[PDB]
């Protein structure tokens, strides 16, 4: 898939992703906070369409992500991120996608997610996160 | 003076300041690097005019600031930053302004200057810097 | 179980843990690096005995942990860390313990594990890690 790297920012304001309850996660785009100002990240899109869009608006700066979990699995022979869930200090968003395969979760005692990077072909191949104090 | 705070970024690409060889530093504006892309910072201007502009273009990312020095002094009864000097790993820019008053210098063994904040009335009242690895 | 928190250090030199191939992880103790000098961490022991000791000596500082994975599961009604695996840039140590339950993994693109904290009763109840550049 096509790789992407948004880099790091001051925080996260909104997350826009899409999925298919039969395959995996599709598009991914984030609206970060850049020193108090909204910064619209580049929209990373799937090579195909047919996904269901989902918008996750966070109550910045009082609401922030505390944990990220999901499933990675096999789809058409490719290992991809099939499901994703974002738990903040105020609410839980998801799961989105197919909750099948091998689970993974990232709880954060101290710190913030300040950036995303990954790859997207037909689906989200993989992703990593930037952590900061 | 009017306070400003650019926040933090990935690095510094260019610095645009002005001064008067009789008074102190006037305007201040920085072009930061935001995850590989130039980010034009807000131009913080003096309440008055008559300054000499100076552009400091750095060879980003191979050239970075290693030390910042200057003088703070008294002008019309206000304590301000009269002089400023930026020494990178490739060249020395300055001094700019009046080299009179009490000196200050910030050498950096490990780390980078990733942001500026301060205040500007007729002159640059004061400033602080964001440091990062 | 009894909680512990080693705090943060400069790095990791050696890890000493014990396990039982039928239950879960038992004892845990780490020898950290404190600014170039070995620092023997407190040995956190299980309330019971019967575990198999394992010593993981890392080639500090050229060898460091890149990923930590394992399984959390149910043992006598308590949720504990049943298995643990440390993958460095030179070797893979483990799995140690029972590879059954729900999996978790922490891959690190950039950064180092500089400290551990957790809880131990009959078994390792849970644990968290300190990350640093």
């Amino acid at each position: 898939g096509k790789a992407f790297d948004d880099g790091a920012f001051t925080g996260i304001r909104e997350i826009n992703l899409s999925y298919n309850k039969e395959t995996a996660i599709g598009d991914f785009q984030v609206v970060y906070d850049l020193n108090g100002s909204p910064y619209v990240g580049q929209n990373h899109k799937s090579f195909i369409t047919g996904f269901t869009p989902v918008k996750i608006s966070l109550d910045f700066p009082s609401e922030y992500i505390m944990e990220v979990s999901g499933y990675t699995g096999n789809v058409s022979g490719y290992v991809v991120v099939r499901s994703l869930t974002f738990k903040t200090n105020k609410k839980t968003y998801g799961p989105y996608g197919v909750t099948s395969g091998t689970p993974f979760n990232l709880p954060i005692e101290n710190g913030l997610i300040v950036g995303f990077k990954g790859s997207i072909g037909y689906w989200l191949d993989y992703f990593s996160m930037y952590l900061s104090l | 003076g009017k306070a400003f705070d650019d926040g933090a970024f990935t690095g510094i690409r260019e610095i645009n300041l002005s001064y008067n060889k009789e008074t102190a530093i006037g305007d201040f504006q920085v072009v930061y690097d935001l995850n590989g892309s130039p980010y034009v910072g807000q131009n913080h201007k003096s309440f008055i005019t008559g300054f000499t502009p100076v552009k400091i273009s750095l060879d980003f990312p191979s050239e970075y600031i290693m030390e910042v020095s200057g003088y703070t002094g008294n002008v019309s009864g206000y304590v301000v930053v009269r002089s400023l000097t930026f020494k990178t790993n490739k060249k020395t820019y300055g001094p700019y302004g009046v080299t009179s008053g009490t000196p200050f210098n910030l050498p950096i063994e490990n780390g980078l200057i990733v942001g500026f904040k301060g205040s500007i009335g007729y002159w640059l009242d004061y400033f602080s810097m964001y440091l990062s690895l | 179980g009894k909680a512990f928190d080693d705090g943060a250090f400069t790095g990791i030199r050696e890890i000493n843990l014990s396990y039982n191939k039928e239950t879960a992880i038992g004892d845990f103790q780490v020898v950290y690096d404190l600014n170039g000098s070995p620092y023997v961490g407190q040995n956190h022991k299980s309330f019971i005995t019967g575990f198999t000791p394992v010593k993981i000596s890392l080639d500090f500082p050229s060898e460091y942990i890149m990923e930590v994975s394992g399984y959390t599961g149910n043992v006598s009604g308590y949720v504990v860390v049943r298995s643990l695996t440390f993958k460095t840039n030179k070797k893979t140590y483990g799995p140690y313990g029972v590879t059954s339950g729900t999996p978790f993994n922490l891959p690190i693109e950039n950064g180092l594990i500089v400290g551990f904290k957790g809880s131990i009763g009959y078994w390792l109840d849970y644990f968290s890690m300190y990350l640093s550049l």
């Binding site: 990675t72 191949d125 993989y126 996160m129 | 690097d33 970075y64 | 950039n110």
Partner: peptide, 15 residues
């Protein structure tokens, strides 16, 4: 170099 770095965890998914 002159690029600021930060901690990065992952990736999860395709290796």
């Amino acid at each position: 170099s002159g690029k600021s770095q930060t901690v990065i965890v992952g990736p999860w998914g395709a290796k």
